[PDB]
């Protein structure tokens, strides 16, 4: 119920010579779906005040996707850890799941030079976007 | 007349300088050409593709940033015999940031030669001439 | 050992605003490192005769990478299945393992419309490049 | 005088038409500029970056393909006060396939303005002047 929803229009440049969306495009669309999450950690989205660092990703390529039809990225929180969070995410096209992903990010405080227990205000915000399939 | 395409910049589109990287700009211009490609190839199928770029010009007027939407405006400047010239701009925060021209030819991948743009495509393109 | 080695020069457009190589670049570099495997399946690298379809990937981001120094992609065959294979792969910079990956491809025969068991001749040649960590 | 950069094309750099996508050509041109960036900024630190592009043009002469290396030739066509014009070509199979001209300025981010190229950089640039027919 609580996931973020991001509609994207595929581009010719995101295909490859096989005629489908290229596999390296999927992490690009998944990162696009994390936008609202990034915004919770860095409200002005300034790279001066950037906090989010990926440490792991996994993607299952379930069905091929095509240039010419929109896709929808669903992005939710599978686990809120201490200094990390594990995202669950899916890409759909034509109402069919085509890619499923998980990613783990660490909230890194560059000012203090250490991973930072996610502040409480953020945890509350994140709890209302939990998605556990 | 012109097409309007709203895009949400991505972190991967910036570089270490902290702005949108110059190579993103042509990617965004190509995205604004979508409705043009559709006039040439209505089902956007690659087996029926007929567009080949021959020239591109880009003026980078102002820096763009991750975190705010940009808008691509794309229109036809010239419909030539085999080529067409696209005039195109990208705006962020109500400011023109990039201005572009690109030239494509109508291309027949079956015979390997550029080909005159068909009357019925010219007809469809004429609405979108600046 | 027996894995493939691919030296790559990072590009400015591959970094992001945080100032390191962006995470979406790593799967692009891994794919570049699979070049000799693709050639085994499609000797002329023609897309009309393409067969390699990715079905899954995972990446561990061990250390940050930077524009300004080359990287080395090491790509080995971890497993040769029937219709699929598993690739184990790493990216090093400055002599430090910065990313570790696994990917699974299927040999998809676009002519017969379904997955193809890997032909005996490719199987023998793939065996020349196995690497299990 | 010119720099020479050999690049191995990647599957992700093609599109569904079966050839290298036009948006890859500026990415390859930016890679050929690497040693020019180094003249401005020896250690390629983003903290000390100076170059901002103001204009680019590309002539696409012949289509390029995945599966054969390409070579980028890059030289300085003119050194202005605050700007320089770079002339660049990309070759595949011994044939010129793209020609480019780009204009960068030396930019001060601390003051937010282009500024005269300093004498010590100008001295370096003069050695890489390339002005073809
Ligand atoms: Mg592509
Ligand atoms: Mg980038």
- The answer to whether B10 and A31 have CB atoms below 8 angstroms apart is yes
What values do phi and psi take at A105, rounded to 5?
-120, 150
- Measured between CB atoms, which of A6, A13, A28 is closest to B30? A13
Contact C68 D43 (CB under 8 A): yes
Q: How many residues does chain A have?
A: 133
Q: What is the dihedral of CA B89, B90, B95, B98, to 10 degrees?
A: -70
Strands B51-60, C71-80: pairing kind: unpaired
Ligand 1 centroid vs D133 CA: distance in angstroms? 33
- The answer to whether C48 and C100 have CB atoms below 8 angstroms apart is no
- The answer to whether A25 and A14 have CB atoms below 8 angstroms apart is yes
Ligand closest to CA C31: 1
Q: Which of left, alpha, beta for D67 (phi over 0: left; psi -120 to 50: alpha)?
A: left
- The answer to whether C87 and C34 have CB atoms below 8 angstroms apart is yes
Which SS3 state, helix, strand or coil, does residue A67 take? Answer: coil
Cα–Cα dist C11/D85, whole Å:
20
Whole-number CA gyration radius for chain A? 16
Q: Which of left, alpha, beta for C40 (phi over 0: left; psi -120 to 50: alpha)?
A: alpha
Does B12 reach chain C within 8 Å, measured CB to CB? Answer: yes
Q: CA A56 → CA A39, C122, D127, distances in Å? A: 20, 32, 45
Method: X-ray
What b/e sequence results for A48-70 when a residue is b if at least 16 CB atoms lie within 10 Å of its CB, and e otherwise?
A: eebbbbbbbbebbbbeebbbbee
- Give the pair of three-digit tokens for residue A114: 């250490």
What distance in Å separates residue C54's CA from the closest CA in chain A? 7
Q: Which of left, alpha, beta for B91 (phi over 0: left; psi -120 to 50: alpha)?
A: beta
Cα–Cα dist B8/B31, whole Å:
12
What b/e sequence results for A115-130 when a residue is b if at least 16 CB atoms lie within 10 Å of its CB, and e otherwise?
A: bbebeeebeebbeebe
Cα–Cα dist C111/C48, whole Å:
10
What distance in Å separates residue C51's CA from the closest CA in chain A? 9
Q: CA D15 → CA A60, A66, C25, C126, distances in Å? A: 22, 11, 18, 28
Cα–Cα dist C94/C115, whole Å:
40
Q: Which of left, alpha, beta for B94 (phi over 0: left; psi -120 to 50: alpha)?
A: left
Residue B124, classified by CB atoms within 10 Å of its CB into exposed (0-12), middle (13-18) or buried (19+), is middle
Ligand 2 centroid vs B76 CA: distance in angstroms? 29
- The answer to whether D48 and D55 have CB atoms below 8 angstroms apart is no
- The answer to whether A11 and A53 have CB atoms below 8 angstroms apart is no
Q: CA D13 → CA C53, C72, D25, distances in Å? A: 16, 19, 9
Cα–Cα dist C61/C127, whole Å:
28
Q: How many residues does chain B have?
A: 130
Residue from C65, C100, D35 nearest B16 by CA: C65
Residue from B58, B100, B87, B55 nearest D59 by CA: B55
- Give the pair of three-digit tokens for residue B20: 């949108």
Does D123 reach chain C within 8 Å, measured CB to CB? Answer: no
Q: Can you give the CATH number for the domain in which A88 is found?
A: 3.10.129.10
Residue C128, classified by CB atoms within 10 Å of its CB into exposed (0-12), middle (13-18) or buried (19+), is exposed
In the DSSP assignment, the letter for residue C21 is: B
- The answer to whether C73 and C84 have CB atoms below 8 angstroms apart is no
Cα–Cα dist C31/C108, whole Å:
17
Cα C31 → chain centroid: 4
Contact C45 D37 (CB under 8 A): no
Ligand 1 centroid vs A112 CA: distance in angstroms? 39
What is the domain count for chain B?
1
Cα–Cα dist D115/D106, whole Å:
6
Which residue, chain included where needed, has tokens 């686990």?
A79
Does B63 reach chain C within 8 Å, measured CB to CB? Answer: no
What distance in Å separates residue A36's CA from the closest CA in chain C? 17
Residue B95: domain span: 1-130
Q: What resolution in Å is listed for this PDB structure?
A: 2.0
- Contacts of D125 by beta carbon, 8 Å cutoff, 6+ apart: D36, D39, D76, D79, D84, D117
Minimum Cα–Cα distance from B31: chain D residue: D23
Does A31 reach chain C within 8 Å, measured CB to CB? Answer: yes
Cα–Cα dist A96/A10, whole Å:
16
Minimum Cα–Cα distance from D65: chain A residue: A17
Does C1 reach chain B within 8 Å, measured CB to CB? Answer: no
**Residues with C-beta atoms within 5 A of ion ligand 1:** A 13; D 15, 21
- Contacts of B79 by beta carbon, 8 Å cutoff, 6+ apart: B117, B122, B125, B126, B129
- Contacts of B64 by beta carbon, 8 Å cutoff, 6+ apart: B9, B19, B20, B70, B90, B92, B97, B98
- The answer to whether C115 and C108 have CB atoms below 8 angstroms apart is yes
Residue from A79, A77, A84 nearest A118 by CA: A84
Cα C58 → chain centroid: 11
């Amino acid at each position: 119920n609580a996931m973020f929803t991001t509609v994207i229009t595929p581009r010719v440049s995101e295909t490859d010579g096989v005629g489908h969306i290229n596999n390296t495009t999927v992490p690009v669309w998944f990162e696009a779906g994390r936008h609202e999450i990034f915004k919770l950690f860095t409200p002005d989205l300034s790279f001066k005040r950037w906090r989010m660092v990926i440490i792991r990703m996994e993607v299952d390529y379930v069905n091929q996707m095509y240039y010419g039809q929109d896709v929808t990225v669903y992005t939710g929180i599978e686990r809120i850890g201490n200094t990390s969070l594990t995202i669950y995410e899916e890409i759909h096209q034509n109402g069919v799941v085509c890619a499923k992903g998980r990613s783990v990010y660490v909230n890194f405080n560059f000012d203090t030079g250490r991973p930072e227990p996610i502040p409480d205000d953020i945890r509350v915000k994140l709890r209302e976007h939990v998605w556990q399939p």
